């Protein structure tokens, strides 16, 4: 339970992070 | 210890997300 829950939360956040870093990259260099 | 490691990574990532949104905000307004 706790481990599963936390890995789902981690996963979600890393998708958001990935997206945001790509958007930042775009804005700084284009 | 997988749980320990993941709680540290979660913490870090929430700070990184916050930081990046503030950088995006900054760049929109110069
Ligand atoms: Na568990
Ligand atoms: Na939990
Ligand atoms: Na642990
Ligand atoms: Na945490
Ligand atoms: Na806790």
PDB file of C-alpha atoms and ligand atoms in Angstrom:
ATOM      1  CA  UNK A   1       0.000   0.000   0.000  1.00  0.00           C
ATOM      2  CA  UNK A   2       2.243   2.922   1.140  1.00  0.00           C
ATOM      3  CA  UNK A   3       5.057   2.075  -1.354  1.00  0.00           C
ATOM      4  CA  UNK A   4       2.577   1.598  -4.220  1.00  0.00           C
ATOM      5  CA  UNK A   5       0.827   4.889  -3.393  1.00  0.00           C
ATOM      6  CA  UNK A   6       4.087   6.823  -3.229  1.00  0.00           C
ATOM      7  CA  UNK A   7       5.400   5.384  -6.565  1.00  0.00           C
ATOM      8  CA  UNK A   8       2.108   6.479  -8.255  1.00  0.00           C
ATOM      9  CA  UNK A   9       2.550   9.983  -6.807  1.00  0.00           C
ATOM     10  CA  UNK A  10       6.224  10.060  -7.901  1.00  0.00           C
ATOM     11  CA  UNK A  11       5.277   8.929 -11.431  1.00  0.00           C
ATOM     12  CA  UNK A  12       2.616  11.632 -11.804  1.00  0.00           C
ATOM     13  CA  UNK A  13       4.982  14.358 -10.627  1.00  0.00           C
ATOM     14  CA  UNK A  14       7.824  13.250 -13.005  1.00  0.00           C
ATOM     15  CA  UNK A  15       5.363  13.513 -15.989  1.00  0.00           C
ATOM     16  CA  UNK A  16       4.543  17.076 -14.866  1.00  0.00           C
ATOM     17  CA  UNK A  17       8.269  17.878 -14.357  1.00  0.00           C
ATOM     18  CA  UNK A  18       9.174  16.448 -17.790  1.00  0.00           C
ATOM     19  CA  UNK A  19       6.474  18.550 -19.459  1.00  0.00           C
ATOM     20  CA  UNK A  20       7.485  21.752 -17.657  1.00  0.00           C
ATOM     21  CA  UNK A  21      11.232  21.358 -18.413  1.00  0.00           C
ATOM     22  CA  UNK A  22      10.382  20.969 -22.142  1.00  0.00           C
ATOM     23  CA  UNK A  23       8.189  24.103 -22.021  1.00  0.00           C
ATOM     24  CA  UNK A  24      10.985  26.032 -20.219  1.00  0.00           C
ATOM     25  CA  UNK A  25      13.534  24.845 -22.803  1.00  0.00           C
ATOM     26  CA  UNK A  26      11.218  26.001 -25.620  1.00  0.00           C
ATOM     27  CA  UNK A  27      10.703  29.462 -24.124  1.00  0.00           C
ATOM     28  CA  UNK A  28      14.426  30.067 -23.349  1.00  0.00           C
ATOM     29  CA  UNK A  29      15.733  28.834 -26.780  1.00  0.00           C
ATOM     30  CA  UNK A  30      12.816  29.690 -29.151  1.00  0.00           C
TER      31      UNK A  30
ATOM     32  CA  UNK B   1      15.871   1.471   1.545  1.00  0.00           C
ATOM     33  CA  UNK B   2      13.327   1.996  -1.275  1.00  0.00           C
ATOM     34  CA  UNK B   3      10.727   3.880   0.860  1.00  0.00           C
ATOM     35  CA  UNK B   4      13.342   6.235   2.342  1.00  0.00           C
ATOM     36  CA  UNK B   5      14.824   6.897  -1.103  1.00  0.00           C
ATOM     37  CA  UNK B   6      11.419   7.613  -2.645  1.00  0.00           C
ATOM     38  CA  UNK B   7      10.358  10.044   0.156  1.00  0.00           C
ATOM     39  CA  UNK B   8      13.595  12.026  -0.435  1.00  0.00           C
ATOM     40  CA  UNK B   9      12.947  12.030  -4.219  1.00  0.00           C
ATOM     41  CA  UNK B  10       9.313  13.143  -3.724  1.00  0.00           C
ATOM     42  CA  UNK B  11      10.405  16.054  -1.529  1.00  0.00           C
ATOM     43  CA  UNK B  12      13.054  17.170  -4.037  1.00  0.00           C
ATOM     44  CA  UNK B  13      10.668  16.952  -7.001  1.00  0.00           C
ATOM     45  CA  UNK B  14       7.957  19.080  -5.312  1.00  0.00           C
ATOM     46  CA  UNK B  15      10.604  21.817  -4.757  1.00  0.00           C
ATOM     47  CA  UNK B  16      11.781  21.501  -8.410  1.00  0.00           C
ATOM     48  CA  UNK B  17       8.191  21.768  -9.732  1.00  0.00           C
ATOM     49  CA  UNK B  18       7.536  24.875  -7.624  1.00  0.00           C
ATOM     50  CA  UNK B  19      10.850  26.429  -8.747  1.00  0.00           C
ATOM     51  CA  UNK B  20      10.225  25.798 -12.445  1.00  0.00           C
ATOM     52  CA  UNK B  21       6.696  27.322 -12.362  1.00  0.00           C
ATOM     53  CA  UNK B  22       8.233  30.477 -10.766  1.00  0.00           C
ATOM     54  CA  UNK B  23      10.930  30.589 -13.507  1.00  0.00           C
ATOM     55  CA  UNK B  24       8.170  30.284 -16.176  1.00  0.00           C
ATOM     56  CA  UNK B  25       6.226  33.109 -14.483  1.00  0.00           C
ATOM     57  CA  UNK B  26       9.391  35.267 -14.535  1.00  0.00           C
ATOM     58  CA  UNK B  27      10.083  34.625 -18.219  1.00  0.00           C
ATOM     59  CA  UNK B  28       6.491  35.550 -19.322  1.00  0.00           C
ATOM     60  CA  UNK B  29       7.007  39.045 -17.812  1.00  0.00           C
ATOM     61  CA  UNK B  30      10.627  39.486 -18.911  1.00  0.00           C
TER      62      UNK B  30
HETATM   63 NA1  LIG C   1       4.062  -0.700   1.533  1.00  0.00          NA
HETATM   64 NA1  LIG C   2       0.683   7.660   1.193  1.00  0.00          NA
HETATM   65 NA1  LIG C   3      13.599   2.385   3.773  1.00  0.00          NA
HETATM   66 NA1  LIG C   4       7.941  13.243   0.869  1.00  0.00          NA
HETATM   67 NA1  LIG C   5       5.447  10.407   6.171  1.00  0.00          NA
END
